[PDB]
Write a protein that binds this ligand. Sequence first.
Ligand SMILES: *[C@@H]1O[C@H](CO)[C@@H](O[C@@H]2O[C@H](CO)[C@@H](O)[C@H](O)[C@H]2NC(C)=O)[C@H](O)[C@H]1NC(C)=O
Ligand SMILES: *[C@@H]1O[C@H](CO)[C@@H](O[C@@H]2O[C@H](CO)[C@@H](O)[C@H](O)[C@H]2NC(C)=O)[C@H](O)[C@H]1NC(C)=O
Ligand SMILES: *[C@@H]1O[C@H](CO)[C@@H](O[C@@H]2O[C@H](CO)[C@@H](O)[C@H](O)[C@H]2NC(C)=O)[C@H](O)[C@H]1NC(C)=O
Ligand SMILES: *[C@@H]1O[C@H](CO)[C@@H](O[C@@H]2O[C@H](CO)[C@@H](O)[C@H](O)[C@H]2NC(C)=O)[C@H](O)[C@H]1NC(C)=O
Ligand code: NAG
Ligand code: NAG
Ligand code: NAG
Ligand code: NAG
Ligand code: NAG
Ligand code: NAG
Ligand code: NAG
Ligand code: NAG
Lengths: 49, 98, 49, 175, 245
Amino acid sequence: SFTVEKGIYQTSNFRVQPTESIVRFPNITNLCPFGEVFNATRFASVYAW
Amino acid sequence: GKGYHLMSFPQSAPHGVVFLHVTYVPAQEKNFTTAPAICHDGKAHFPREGVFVSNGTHWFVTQRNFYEPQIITTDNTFVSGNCDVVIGIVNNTVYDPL
Amino acid sequence: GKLQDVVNQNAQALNTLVKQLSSNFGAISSVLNDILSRLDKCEAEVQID
Amino acid sequence: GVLTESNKKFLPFQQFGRDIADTTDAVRDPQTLEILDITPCSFGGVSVITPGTNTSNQVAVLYQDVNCTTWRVYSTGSNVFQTRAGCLIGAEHVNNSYECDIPIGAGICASYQTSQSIIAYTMSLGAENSVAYSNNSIAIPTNFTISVTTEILPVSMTKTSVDCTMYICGDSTEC
Amino acid sequence: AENSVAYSNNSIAIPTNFTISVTTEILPVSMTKTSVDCTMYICGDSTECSNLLLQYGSFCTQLNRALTGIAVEQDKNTQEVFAQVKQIYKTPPIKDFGGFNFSQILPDPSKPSKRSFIEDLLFNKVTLADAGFIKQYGDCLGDIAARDLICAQKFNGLTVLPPLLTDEMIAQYTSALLAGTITSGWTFGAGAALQIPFAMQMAYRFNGIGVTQNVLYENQKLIANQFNSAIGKIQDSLSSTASAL
Ligand SMILES: *[C@@H]1O[C@H](CO)[C@@H](O[C@@H]2O[C@H](CO)[C@@H](O)[C@H](O)[C@H]2NC(C)=O)[C@H](O)[C@H]1NC(C)=O
Ligand SMILES: *[C@@H]1O[C@H](CO)[C@@H](O[C@@H]2O[C@H](CO)[C@@H](O)[C@H](O)[C@H]2NC(C)=O)[C@H](O)[C@H]1NC(C)=O
Ligand SMILES: *[C@@H]1O[C@H](CO)[C@@H](O[C@@H]2O[C@H](CO)[C@@H](O)[C@H](O)[C@H]2NC(C)=O)[C@H](O)[C@H]1NC(C)=O
Ligand SMILES: *[C@@H]1O[C@H](CO)[C@@H](O[C@@H]2O[C@H](CO)[C@@H](O)[C@H](O)[C@H]2NC(C)=O)[C@H](O)[C@H]1NC(C)=O
Ligand SMILES: *[C@@H]1O[C@H](CO)[C@@H](O)[C@H](O)[C@H]1NC(C)=O
Ligand SMILES: *[C@@H]1O[C@H](CO)[C@@H](O)[C@H](O)[C@H]1NC(C)=O
Ligand SMILES: *[C@@H]1O[C@H](CO)[C@@H](O)[C@H](O)[C@H]1NC(C)=O
Ligand SMILES: *[C@@H]1O[C@H](CO)[C@@H](O)[C@H](O)[C@H]1NC(C)=O
Ligand SMILES: *[C@@H]1O[C@H](CO)[C@@H](O)[C@H](O)[C@H]1NC(C)=O
Ligand SMILES: *[C@@H]1O[C@H](CO)[C@@H](O)[C@H](O)[C@H]1NC(C)=O
Ligand SMILES: *[C@@H]1O[C@H](CO)[C@@H](O)[C@H](O)[C@H]1NC(C)=O
Ligand SMILES: *[C@@H]1O[C@H](CO)[C@@H](O)[C@H](O)[C@H]1NC(C)=O
């Protein structure tokens, strides 16, 4: 409504906005063995995977 | 309603009822000096209904909720025991019809 | 006001019931006709559920 | 959320901690091996005290659970008074005691009085008068008044009926 | 306990004495006023969740309307129970009520609050969950080690609003009721308070229960002693057990 009668009204609790964003990942730099997994000269049989 | 209830009147309102409570509210209080009983001939007198009051000199017996003083008389009070055990008892004469 | 409260409470309850028909409740839409017109009988049953 | 230093001791095979609500409390920081406690940054109730919007557009904000004696308040401005119910911002404290108009709480009420402004005050329980009690004094009424008081009581409410098929499935056979 | 009662058509048992018995009855009047925030409970801090919740605004308005009604109801309950009289009577400085002792059930001026002795015992015998209504953000941030339940409630949007009348003010109302009752009897309820000596008030009360008012006067000291002993018994009882409240 555009009109509010006399009284006291509960509103949403006090909000604090995030001031900045951070990202924390483990300290590692090696690339995963994509070549050894996908570029493998010899794949295994399905029964012995 | 506030005060002693005399009688109520009902009225209908939408989805409800309205009671007009006519009640009796005492209005004009006045101070008096009083005692629980009076010693007449060594025997204490207590009101059968009422209370002893005094306007300074004389002692009357009056009803509880309205100042209607009456002369102290045997038909206004009743006797029980001597006039020493009672605390706050006073001295006064108890009239008798003659 | 004690009786006007009763009248207003009943009227507001019914109006709230009418207003609450605009919720999706997880469905793709809050309107039966929209669901039945864009979806076949197959998943229209899931949404109408 | 807010990250703070934690005294929790995680086992070597643990990375997160959790409430009874299973929301994440503590996290082992992956770079430096320390435990950080996570907390929400939204906290504390807020109430708005207003007269009618046609009466005025001013409002006083009661921030419960904040001490105003920087702050977790939208705006300080002026007239910052620490009530027992919270921190009232936008209302002028007065030393008088009136009847309650807008109950703030904790024995504090607010009203809109005169330059018009919102005032806050401790309510008045009533007129303070004693009685001249004595062991040999009685007050007796010499007159009376007949008072007619009104008492309103609700007796019934509107009888309602509901059709499921027409509310849930209005004019839809498949529904 | 089985107890057969002797009966006959020409036999009657008449009392020859009496006891003034003071009993305690406890009644809840209000409960905690509570408020709920859908956004902060259902959707902790995510904006996506609040955007999704935007279509249930009617449901949340319904919930908060019901809770606000409950809160106003609690305030009205306390007001109607305790604000019977809007005249704050105060007891006279001299306490001469014909041997009756009201020290335990009257305000103590030598305490920060004006609660009586019995009121102090009662307030000490109930452990309030909140014990206050100011829980600052710093305090909840500084006790992450201790799993405080109030902080967990308040971080999910569940707040407890303070009651309108504080305990000191309800104590003031009760003290006014005591003062009016002992200084004027029932008259202060039925309009303006009319003073009457307490012995004569008790005489009226005795006449009310169908025994002549004299027996009080011939037994005023005994009745006062019995009342004092009963009050002391209540005081001792409330200070020993925990199931009373
Ligand atoms: C009512 O009258 C009797 C008359 O005897 C009073 O009794 C005397 O009171 C005086 C003062 O206390 C004593 O010195 C006498 O010894 C009493 N005489 C007897 C026979 O009792 C009595 O005091 C009067 N009551 C009041 C309240 O004054
Ligand atoms: C008791 O109170 C009533 C009114 O409350 C008094 O009646 C009034 O008396 C004055 C005296 O001239 C009149 O002018 C008024 O018109 C009366 N009012 C009504 C409604 O009738 C009455 O006099 C009082 N009686 C005593 C003994 O004090
Ligand atoms: C009515 O009961 C009370 C006891 O509750 C009696 O008062 C006791 O009387 C004896 C007499 O020796 C005293 O030893 C006690 O100290 C009294 N107790 C109290 C609290 O006063 C009283 O006597 C009985 N009434 C009658 C007529 O026998
Ligand atoms: C009424 O009962 C109390 C019991 O506590 C009597 O004793 C007093 O108690 C109060 C507690 O509020 C103390 O402050 C006083 O020091 C106590 N006085 C004494 C002599 O013990 C009290 O005396 C009784 N009232 C009367 C008039 O005797
Ligand atoms: C690299 O990893 C180690 C341990 O994981 C950590 O101590 C160090 O801070 C990391 N380097 C940087 C620049 O953060
Ligand atoms: C995979 O094999 C092809 C052909 O030798 C080569 O061009 C490509 O660079 C290889 N990719 C990776 C990730 O090793
Ligand atoms: C009765 O006495 C007291 C004290 O003198 C006084 O305040 C009061 O006004 C008196 N009552 C009336 C009706 O005048
Ligand atoms: C008390 O009342 C009586 C009779 O009405 C009268 O004779 C006497 O003068 C009055 N005394 C006082 C002090 O009013
Ligand atoms: C009433 O009080 C006064 C002073 O307090 C005293 O002189 C008088 O003796 C008392 N009367 C009775 C019956 O106790
Ligand atoms: C608000 O105040 C104006 C007068 O200034 C009046 O016309 C109007 O009816 C009022 N509206 C409400 C809801 O009180
Ligand atoms: C915090 O609020 C309470 C409420 O009375 C107050 O006593 C206290 O002084 C406030 N804290 C400080 C440092 O003033
Ligand atoms: C209110 O009363 C207190 C204590 O007497 C005083 O410090 C203060 O200045 C007063 N404020 C106003 C506006 O009267």
